[PDB]
Structures are given as C-alpha cells and as structure tokens.
RNA sequence: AAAACUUUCAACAACGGGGUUCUCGCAUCGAUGAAGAACGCAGCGAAAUGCGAUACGUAAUGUGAAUUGCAGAAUUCCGUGAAUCAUCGAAUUGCGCCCCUUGGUAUUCCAGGGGGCAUGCCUGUUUGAGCGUCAUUU
C-alpha cells in the first residue's frame, strides 16, 4: 500500500511544478525511488502495473489523434498525455530503475527491476515521438535527460542522437528569429511547455540551442572513455557538418561547430589510447578495462563537459540563492501592512 | 517482388494577407540667405573644389585668347571679348569713349605697355562766350 499510495500521489495529488516546488517535488521522487527498491519482487509487481496505466493513456491518445472519431478531442488529446504529471511519472521510473539497477546495488546479481529498463524506455521514446513541434521541446528534453541517467546508471544503450537530430530540422532550430522583445530566458529546468509567447524568439532559439548542446555533451559524454566511441562518433560529425554546412543561423552553428571539434578530439584520444591495445571485441572483461585508470573528467569532451556543467549549476545556484533571497525581501513587506 | 490508397494529426514547403484634416499650447522677425527638401548638379563626372531649381552658377569691375580626359563652341582678332580666369560691393557675360608711352621699314599699317572715362545732382575753384543790361573826355 506504501507504493501504491506514493505513486499515485505522482499521479493525480502531485504538486503544480514551480521553481519552489523543484526540490521539494526531487526530494519525494528520491525518496520514493528507494521504497521501491526495498523489495526486488514486490517493486517489480507493483511498477509494472503501473507503467502499463501510463502506457494505456499514451496507446488511448495516439489511437484518438490519429483515428477520426469525434470521441474526446481529435485534435488537441496532447492535453492528456503531454502533462507534468505523466513527465514527472516517467522520470519517477527512471529514478527508480537506476536506483535498483546501479552497479554496487547489483552487486555482480542480476535485479528484476533491470527488465522494466526495456517498457519504460519504449513508453519514454514512444512520449517524446508523439509531437515533434517547438511547443514542446522542453518537454522532450527532460525525458532525454531522465533517459541519459538511466543509461548512466544501469550501462544501457540508450538511442537518442536520433531523436535530437531529428529536431534540428525544425523551424525554430533552422530559421533566423523572427521577433525579438527581449523577455525573460525560458525556465527549460523547471518547465514543460513555451507558452506561445516565446515561440519563435532570439531568446527561445538561443536557449533551446543551449539545452540542445549540452544534451548532446552529456549524452556522447558518457562513453567519452570507451573504446567504441570513434564509431560512436562518426556518422554523428558527419550528420552534424551537413547540418552546420547548410544552417543558416550564424550562433547555432558556432555552438554545434565546438561540440564537433570536441568530438574529433576525443576520438583522437580514445584512437591514441586503443592502438596499444592487444585485445579483441570479443573479450568482454578487458573491454570494460579499458582506462579504468583515467577519470572520465580527465578526457577532452569531460573536460569540456564538465566545466559546462558547473558553469551551468552554478546559474542554477544563483536563481534559487536570487529567488529565497526575494521571498525574505516579500517578508519584510508584510511586517509592516 | 510490400508497397500503394482513404482519413486524422504532426511537422516542413508553397499559396495567402508620407500626405490630408481637426484640436491644443507657445511668442522667437532681420536686407549678410534661416529652418526644411533633394534630383546629387557640369554636354559627357567618381573623389576635390564651386554653387543653390537663376544650382562647377546670375549681375557689376578688371584682365586679355582660352577650357581640356572626351565632345563642342569659337574671336569676325585686333577687339563691346573666350576663360573650371580674377575681383566681387548687386551668361544682359548688355552698351561704350578716349588719353598717355615704346618698338616694328613707319606720315598711313601693325604690335606691345600704362592710364583714365557711365550718367544725374549740390557746393566751390578755374576758364571762356552772350547784339542780355550798363558806365566810360577828372
């Protein structure tokens, strides 16, 4: 009854997302993340069954959307299904499986809650496909980040270059901003939809770019110390000089134009560091060897990455140590109505 | 030889959609070209210079055969006259007159150089003229 109560608090009682509700809402899923993996088999009969409610409603809204039936909304079922609800369901999931799936958890012994992996990356890839449009691409990039961990913690191959190339044909991605009424930067962390006011913006590109880029770092920064990456790597430049060639937005492609150089770079490292190797693809052991010495911050995509990363929590820091700090100016108000 | 076709979404791509008038307040004018406008101006010009629809300018005065990258006017030239000429006080490039000084065969003709002179009016100096009037034997 615990799990059952937790989740479906996740599902219906769940908190309007705000950047005071963010850690708030992260401490309940860290939390409940580990009730779940208390017991191996009695998580794994309760999970799955309620995935399969979420994956119901993602079956019910493709079917409605497609089919002509003038049911429930044709149209705009979106609304059911591309909610903070259902996101933060699935990024429950994932915190749940990586927790059970890490490595010293594992404990050279295979868990039950490793088989999900599979029905929980089929129903994320299968939420982020339903609309490819710039309303929702934030909502596409807290599901790559959630799906970016899971692969971090259990080791699984997680396809999702597809996806973010996929995007960058877009029009928002491609074309040259239209309107520029230097609002706000977009909230990406801590929101799930562009409001409609910032669609097609220098604000909105220049910081759908910034998410878009660092995903990418992530993502190709996680086998930045494996000896696949060359050929991890090369249909990605390839793909990404065609689209830097042909792009027209002059900021975008002095972004990706790093990312790729970074990318040849660290190909060169992994290429310098393989040719000693006496090894073949075969032998599984000495392939998850391979420079166990060297810290992963310590290569050329880390290294960048990394950096990328304080400088972008550090930007996290300042909003909440900005935003605590106008709550305590709010207060001094009312000790003097 | 597993694709096509209909329908609904979704993208992506086409297609698609200064004047004029009224009101209000403020009070500050110059013959030396204000504020404002704009073809960019020259026969053909880019910069430089010059100028203002009278626009590389108009008037007046002087000089005296040019301007010049091209074209084209010419100057009746022995001068009323070009010049992206000068001066400059306000294509008219209008209309003129005469004196002084040197030379080239020189009494004719020619070439240089210099200097004045528009007209009207007032005052005064100088010089003449009038059959206008008049004195004129101490």
Known sequence: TTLKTT????????????????????????????????????????????????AIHLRNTMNAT????????????????YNWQFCHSLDFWSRVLSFACQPEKENGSESPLRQLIYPLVQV???????????????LRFYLIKSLIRLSQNSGVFIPIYPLLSEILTSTAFTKAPKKSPNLAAFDFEHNIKCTQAYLNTKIYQEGLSEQFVDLLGDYFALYCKNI???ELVTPVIISLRRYIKTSTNVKLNKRLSTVVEK???????????????????????EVSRFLNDVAWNKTPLGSYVAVQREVKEEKARLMRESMEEQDKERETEEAKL
């Open 124 to 138: 994320t890839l299968g939420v982020i496909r339903l609309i490819p449009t710039p309303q929702f691409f934030p």
């Open 228 to 230: 696949a990456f060359p």
């Open 263 to 285: 990318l040849n770079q660290n190909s060169t490292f992994i290429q310098e560091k393989r040719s000693d190797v006496e090894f073949g693809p075969t032998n599984k052991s």
């Open 7 to 54: 989740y479906s608090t996740f599902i219906k009682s769940c908190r309007k997302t705000n950047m005071r509700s963010m850690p708030l809402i992260n401490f309940q899923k860290n939390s409940a993340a580990e009730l779940f993996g208390i017991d191996e088999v009695l998580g794994y009969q309760v999970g799955f069954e309620y995935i399969r409610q979420l």
């Open 66 to 81: 497609t089919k002509k039936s003038s049911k429930i909304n044709s149209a705009e079922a979106y609304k059911i299904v």
